[PDB]
Amino acid sequence: QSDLLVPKLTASVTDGAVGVTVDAPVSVTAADGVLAAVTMVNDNGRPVAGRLSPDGLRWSTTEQLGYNRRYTLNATALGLGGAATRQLTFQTSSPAHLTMPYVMPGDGEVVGVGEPVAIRFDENIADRGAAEKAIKITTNPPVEGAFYWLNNREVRWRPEHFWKPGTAVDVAVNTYGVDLGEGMFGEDNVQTHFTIGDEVIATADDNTKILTVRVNGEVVKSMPTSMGKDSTPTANGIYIVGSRYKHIIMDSSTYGVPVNSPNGYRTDVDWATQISYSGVFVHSAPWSVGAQGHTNTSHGCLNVSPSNAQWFYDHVKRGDIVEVVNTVGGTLPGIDGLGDWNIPWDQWRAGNAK
Ligand SMILES: *CC(=O)[C@@H](NC(=O)OCc1ccccc1)[C@@H](C)CC
Ligand SMILES: [Cl-]
Ligand code: NA
User: Does residue 40 contact residue 73 with C-beta atoms inside 8 Å?
Assistant: First the structure.
């Protein structure tokens, strides 16, 4: 015989390891024995918080680990027949730069059926695929969706068709410890959750010059409107409702054209609901009430009466839809910022992660 079982120790890192990613906790496990002592400190001797399972078989760090750190791990395992100790030292990732993600809509919000998930970064993302792999989106009832990038810093996720009311969406951006390309690592994680509200779709038909608001299939409001003139027409397509303003100042000089010129004007506008990054609003237009419902006079915006503008402000929420049809203009760019739904699904599905 002359045989006795000796405790063994195994860990999620190896001694002398470099480039260890902080996207996972570090653990230590005991076999044929139990953990009698476990400690972990950084290069400065500062300890790391951990937790020991009741059976004493598993120890794991409970706080996220830092970059450019050198950690030292000590662990002793005692058993019915022997003991074993190990000291392991490893070096974590050394980023060249960090990037902080920003997600919308906000946590706990109720949004319309056109609202996509948006993850915006504060730096360029050289490895879009890694960014997509690190973003976990849960839908209930489950529905298919896909990623698509609007620029080098913001990516969007949405299903093929408009959301179904009552759908719960949970977004987990787990980019901490992930190399997003060229040494660009995630500064932190993000966790937001939102819900899909009632179906609200408003249709602006250039043939009738009417903006018709439908709530769950029923017409509830019919607004005379004056859209962009033949020289600066309103583009057809689908618009996602964005920010809403009791009032907002629309410049002109911000576009490079001086106000004191033929095609420039400065004005403060009431009851303005943004529906494109390019500057298209549903807003109060006292000056064109006579034209509304007849002819187009704006620069692109959907002019309506003051009372209808305030109504739109009060009855529309972020994510609702505005559809423009039968105008002399082209189609709203798919990567406008609020024109996601104008990209054919097959082109969106395929993505552009390269
Ligand atoms: C309301 C509009 O039609 C414009 N939107 C905007 O943001 O204001 C810019 C502006 C341009 C010229 C004079 C005054 C303000 C259009 C540019 C939106 C297509
Ligand atoms: Cl106007
Ligand atoms: Na050290």
Answer: yes
Residue nearest to atom 12 of ligand 1 (CA): 252
Point out the ligand nearest to the CA of residue 291. Answer: 2
* CA of 96 relative to ligand 2 center, distance in Å: 47
Hunting for tokens 């033929």 — which residue is that? 262
Phi, psi of 254 (to 5 degrees): -65, -25
Which alpha helices (H) appear in the chain, and where do they start and end?
128-133, 306-315, 345-350
Whole-angstrom Cα distance, residue 45 to residue 47? 6
Give the method of determination: X-ray
- What is the resolution in angstroms? 2.3
Same fold, 8-90 and 97-198+345-350: yes
Helix (H, G, I), strand (E, B) or coil at 254: helix
- d(C-alpha 211, C-alpha 275), whole Å: 14
User: What are the structure tokens assigned to 181, written together?
Assistant: 């390309």
Query: 8-90 domain in CATH 3.40.1350.10?
Result: no
Fold of 97-198+345-350: Immunoglobulin-like (2.60.40)
Q: In whole angstroms, how far apart are CA 313 and each of 170, 243, 279, 299, 316?
A: 27, 10, 16, 21, 6
Per-domain boundaries in the chain: 8-90, 97-198+345-350, 202-342
CB 20 near ligand 1, within 6 Å: no
139 SS3 class: strand
The closest-lying atom of ligand 1 relative to the alpha carbon of residue 232 is: 19
> Which fold, 202-342?
L,D-transpeptidase catalytic domain-like (2.40.440)
In a 10 Å sphere around its CB, with 0-12 CB exposed, 13-18 middle and 19+ buried, how is residue 278 labelled? middle
Residues annotated in the binding site, as ranges?
Answer: 179, 182-183, 265, 278-279, 303
DSSP-derived pairing of the beta strands 281-284 and 302-304: parallel
Query: In 37-48, which positions are buried (b, 16+ CB within 10 angstroms) versus exposed (e)?
Result: ebebebeeeeeb
Q: Is 276 in the pocket of ligand 1 (CB under 6 A)?
A: no
Residue from 112, 340, 342 nearest 244 by CA: 112
